[PDB]
Amino acid sequence: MVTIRLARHGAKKRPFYQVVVADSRNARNGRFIERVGFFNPIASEKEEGTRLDLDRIAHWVGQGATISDRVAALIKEV
Amino acid sequence: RTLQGRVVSDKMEKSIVVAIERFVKHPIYGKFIKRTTKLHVHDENNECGIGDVVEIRECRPLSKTKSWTLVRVVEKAVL
Amino acid sequence: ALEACPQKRGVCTRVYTTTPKKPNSALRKVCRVRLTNGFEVTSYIGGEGHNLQEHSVILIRGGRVKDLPGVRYHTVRGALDCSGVKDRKQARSKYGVKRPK
Amino acid sequence: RYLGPKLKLSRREGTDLFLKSGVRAIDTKCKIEQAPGQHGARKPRLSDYGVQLREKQKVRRIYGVLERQFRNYYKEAARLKGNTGENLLALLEGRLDNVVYRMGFGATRAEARQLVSHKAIMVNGRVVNIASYQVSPNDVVSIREKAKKQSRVKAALELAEQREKPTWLEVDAGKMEGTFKRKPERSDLSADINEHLIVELYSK
RNA sequence: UGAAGAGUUUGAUCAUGGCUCAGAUUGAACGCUGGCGGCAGGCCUAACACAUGCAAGUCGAACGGUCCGGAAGAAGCUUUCUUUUGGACAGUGGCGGACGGGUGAGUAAUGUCUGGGAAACUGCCUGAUGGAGGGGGAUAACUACUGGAAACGGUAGCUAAUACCGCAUAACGUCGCAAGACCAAAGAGGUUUUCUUGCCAUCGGAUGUGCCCAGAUGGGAUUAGCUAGUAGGUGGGGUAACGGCUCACCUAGGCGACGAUCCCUAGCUGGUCUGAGAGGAUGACCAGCCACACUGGAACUGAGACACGGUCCAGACUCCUACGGGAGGCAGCAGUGGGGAAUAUUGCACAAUGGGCGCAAGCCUGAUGCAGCCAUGCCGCGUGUAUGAAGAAGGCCUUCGGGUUGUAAAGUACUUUCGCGGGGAGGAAGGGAGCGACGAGCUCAUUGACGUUACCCGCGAAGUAGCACCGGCUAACUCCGUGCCAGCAGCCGCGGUAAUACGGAGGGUGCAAGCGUUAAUCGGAAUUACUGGGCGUAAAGCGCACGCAGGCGGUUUGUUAAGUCAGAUGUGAAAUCCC
């Protein structure tokens, strides 16, 4: 089942997530279908805490792609 | 896919073997090498005889060894 | 060493003495060892004195002894039954000798 | 680093490196101009490899840096465009500990390295305690507000008055600050080094 | 933007030629030594045998009893007992173990890689269309009895559903001919005339696969003729499906020096190391695929496992045993013993991220996040800083005049890693409650392993260093001892009384908690040379002829245009590499 969740590039004291759409089977940090944006928990690296690219996910959503609870929050924030 | 070859045998019925030949460069040396392959093409009309240079196209598997069929004859004969 | 191993254990078959070649003269101490590799080779015994008996059982390092043709290996002192040289105040790294107090 | 008798290195290199009291008439190179040891007297015999070796030696000794980083910095300068020789000194001269020395905050590079490690030196506000820090142009290197009181820098900066600074630099004794104008060229630096020889040694 | 060679076969020279060297790397080990911290990393050797614990459940919005808990009754109190209700276990009933995790034994084959084809299939989830009328039947629990040491088992009686079955409508679909006939389906919960969860049939979406095909995929021919279903045809059987896949009959072919057949070996790849490139080597960490769980074989049930904690049969072994008969299988985690040169805490924890089930609350989750041990590696830091004699003492050398180790130590001043005190982190919102129709939305409240660690502030003592080497390549020297004796040695060699190459000492060079040693990988080798080579005498034309296959082929014109060349487009996963 295709799902839109957060991929953790996360490094030591460098936690960054990549809201991506991919098969629920694949690993958390495996081959993803396509990146729709990014998330910075601390929002320290850049002022732009998150870039959703609404139109993009707006497509996957309705295509059968389901969004996780956490990702849904970020996406809902648009 | 279309392949050109010679009719090296018309012994079987409705079945003719076409000896297709090609030229490819050696992966190491690069010099052109000769390579051929025999394909059992279908010929319901038993129209093609031995020596005929015919064209061969991919078609619905008639048999296990036959997955090609005679399309058109290039030249009349060359033994 | 067979399995390209740095070292190889083995059991001594006989601890006899050998004489150097044309240019040299002495009673070099060697010993036939039956390594686990399945080979029975002769190894040299460095040091001024050793305590290798018949059932010695020692590790082989590997080294040719120019004077003794055939001896292509050296015994590692300080390992197994091969006691390290006594009173070695010098190169203790070799001969396996703990630094005195 | 090395940490040991520096006054002996000057004799070995033949040239007089500025480690400390190089100004005073004490600097052994003033008394006995021969390398240390019981053989510093007999006539030495140098080979092609020797001249290149001793050459880079004095070079690295001046900045008092390890042979590793020194080599690493060499590789870098050799990668970037422009004459390697020039770039070389540029990088080594870019070291924070070195800059501080050039600014006069420290009597020598060794003391400068200490000042940096002691967090007694800042860069563009934020403090930096890494001697290997690469100072870029337009960067301001001043003393710590809290360290402005320590007698050591008080005496160092005091002697700095009236003393000229390199063209690629500019200090303000009053504010006890400093600015890195640009990367110093080989023309600006007057080191007893022959960059053409140090580059050959690493060739091999 | 990319390429230095040197030593040694001579009395000397040139050439040919082999061997060898300084560098970098290694999930290493060994020797001497060893302070701290961060990140990373750790049986590379037997599928050898294993003590002990642990490695999947969840639902009372499917139904009847025990265990744990609360509340309300009959009582003056006690005993006893009744009703209601929460959790859960035991049972019945429903949905889930073929995912994840481990290992590489086996494996040359469309197994894999790359590019295509079609004779196919796909739970839960999503979109669309239509429907859900009437009836019938069954088995445990439970109850009673009997057998057994135990495991567990036999018999009798009662009983329910979204459990099973028969009948309707035909949206449609299937079959013959052509333009005909046949075949379907369970409720429950409530803010209950309105929604919620769920069901039946069909089409489509999403995704994942079975099968087929072109090309590519190691070594040996002291492995050459091989083959009977063996090659093809008709019909049939069989499967989700093609196919001799299997069968009957007929035909007699099919394959091979572009190497079949046989034998040997090794999981493969993305990538990794190296190299100027080509290429060589490798594929260990991580990611994809494949193949394996006491040894061997097999099938069932299912969308899927021929399935580690499912089943059946054969075999050995271990344990239990009233011996009648049973229980298992760490190549799962940790660990034990055995092996080896060698590789670790039978630790902490779920809050965070992710996963399974559930409407939800919530439950499960040694997956993982961390700590521990080891300089195994990488990076950062400290053992102090400034001052201090034409120049102590001591050791060493001496033409004993003196020189050297030395500003080096002592000593003076300064800072002050450890340690102590205080403070103390990021990494994490809802369930609920209030407003609103307990919906959308808004508002508010409660709660954390590593840690009391990181980090900040205050106080504050100078407070481990070693190892290798000094004939030449290799940078760095003398004295004494020994004396071809003892010993050294990668190669050339050295030692028979003056040795910078033996041992010690002083000194010196290199490096630094590291330093050496051993083993393994790379080029130089233009020494297989495609780029880069040779064959009269240094290694090298086959003794000659004829001739098959194969390779190559004169001048002009035309067609095709396969090779070749050009434009566009698709593919060329991520990561990596380069900027």
From Swiss-Prot, chain A:
Xref: PROSITE patterns: RIBOSOMAL_S16
Record has Kinase as a keyword: no
Its biological purpose: In addition to being a ribosomal protein, S16 also has a cation-dependent endonuclease activity.
Name this protein carries in UniProt: Small ribosomal subunit protein bS16
GO biological process terms held by the UniProt record: cytoplasmic translation; ribosomal small subunit assembly
Cellular component, GO, one term: cytoplasm
GO MF term set: DNA endonuclease activity; four-way junction DNA binding; structural constituent of ribosome
Species whose genome carries this gene: Escherichia coli (strain K12)
Top-level taxon of the source organism: Bacteria
Swiss-Prot record, chain B:
HAMAP family named in the record: Ribosomal_uS17_B
Subunit field text: Part of the 30S ribosomal subunit.
Pfam family, one: Ribosomal_S17
One GO-annotated biological process of the protein: response to antibiotic
PROSITE patterns for the chain: RIBOSOMAL_S17
InterPro entries registered for this protein in UniProt: NA-bd_OB-fold (IPR012340), Ribosomal_uS17 (IPR000266), Ribosomal_uS17_bact/chlr (IPR019984), Ribosomal_uS17_CS (IPR019979)
NCBIfam families (UniProt xref): PRK05610.1, uS17_bact
Any one GO CC term of the record: cytosolic small ribosomal subunit
Gene encoding the protein: rpsQ
UniProt organism field: Escherichia coli (strain K12)
UniProt miscellaneous comment: The strain missing both S17 and L29 grows very slowly and has a rather unstable temperature-sensitive phenotype.
Keywords: Antibiotic resistance, Ribonucleoprotein, Ribosomal protein, RNA-binding, rRNA-binding
Role noted for this protein: One of the primary rRNA binding proteins, it binds specifically to the 5'-end of 16S ribosomal RNA. Also plays a role in translational accuracy; neamine-resistant ribosomes show reduced neamine-induced misreading in vitro.
Stated family: Belongs to the universal ribosomal protein uS17 family.
Name the record gives this protein: Small ribosomal subunit protein uS17
CDD domains, per database record: Ribosomal_uS17
UniProtKB/Swiss-Prot annotation, chain C:
Cellular component per GO, a single term: cytosol
In-chain residues carrying the UniProt-annotated modification N6-acetyllysine: K86
Coiled-coil regions listed in the entry: none
3-methylthioaspartic acid PTM positions: D67
GO biological process, any: response to antibiotic
Alphabetic keyword roster: Acetylation, Antibiotic resistance, Methylation, Ribonucleoprotein, Ribosomal protein, RNA-binding, rRNA-binding, tRNA-binding
A single MF term (Gene Ontology): structural constituent of ribosome
Domain of life: Bacteria
Assembly information from the UniProt record: Part of the 30S ribosomal subunit. Contacts proteins S8 and S17. Interacts with ArfA. May interact with IF1 in the 30S initiation complex.
General function of this protein: With S4 and S5 plays an important role in translational accuracy. Interacts with and stabilizes bases of the 16S rRNA that are involved in tRNA selection in the A site and with the mRNA backbone. Located at the interface of the 30S and 50S subunits, it traverses the body of the 30S subunit contacting proteins on the other side and probably holding the rRNA structure together. The combined cluster of proteins S8, S12 and S17 appears to hold together the shoulder and platform of the 30S subunit.
Other remarks on this protein: At least 19 substitutions or deletions in 11 codons can promote streptomycin resistance, dependence or pseudodependence; all but one of the streptomycin resistant mutations (K42R) are associated with hyperaccurate translation and thus reduced translational efficiency. The streptomycin sensitive allele is dominant to resistant alleles.
Family label: Belongs to the universal ribosomal protein uS12 family.
Residues of the full protein shown: 23 to 123 of 124
Swiss-Prot record, chain D:
GO biological process, one term: DNA-templated transcription termination
GO CC terms of this entry: cytoplasm; cytosol; cytosolic small ribosomal subunit; small ribosomal subunit
Segments forming domain S4 RNA-binding: 94-154
Signal peptide segment: none
Record's keyword terms, sorted: Antibiotic resistance, Repressor, Ribonucleoprotein, Ribosomal protein, Ribosome biogenesis, RNA-binding, rRNA-binding, Transcription, Transcription antitermination, Transcription regulation, Transcription termination, Translation regulation
Molecular function terms, GO-annotated: mRNA 5'-UTR binding; mRNA regulatory element binding translation repressor activity; rRNA binding; structural constituent of ribosome
CDD domains named among the record's database cross-references: S4
Origin superkingdom: Bacteria
Keyword Ligase among record annotations: no
Pfam family, one: S4
Entry keyword annotation includes Lipoprotein: no
Quaternary structure, from the entry: Part of the 30S ribosomal subunit. Contacts protein S5. With proteins S3 and S5 encircles the mRNA as it enters the ribosome, which may play a role in mRNA helicase processivity. Some nascent polypeptide chains are able to cross-link to this protein in situ. The rRNA transcription and antitermination complex (rrnTAC) consists of RNAP, NusA, NusB, NusE (rpsJ), NusG, SubB, ribosomal protein S4, DNA and precursor rRNA; S4 is more flexible than other subunits.
HAMAP family given in the database record: Ribosomal_uS4_B (MF_01306_B)
PANTHER family associated with the record: 30S 40S RIBOSOMAL PROTEIN, SMALL RIBOSOMAL SUBUNIT PROTEIN US4M
Membership in a protein family: Belongs to the universal ribosomal protein uS4 family.
Name the record gives this protein: Small ribosomal subunit protein uS4
Record lineage: Bacteria, Pseudomonadati, Pseudomonadota, Gammaproteobacteria, Enterobacterales
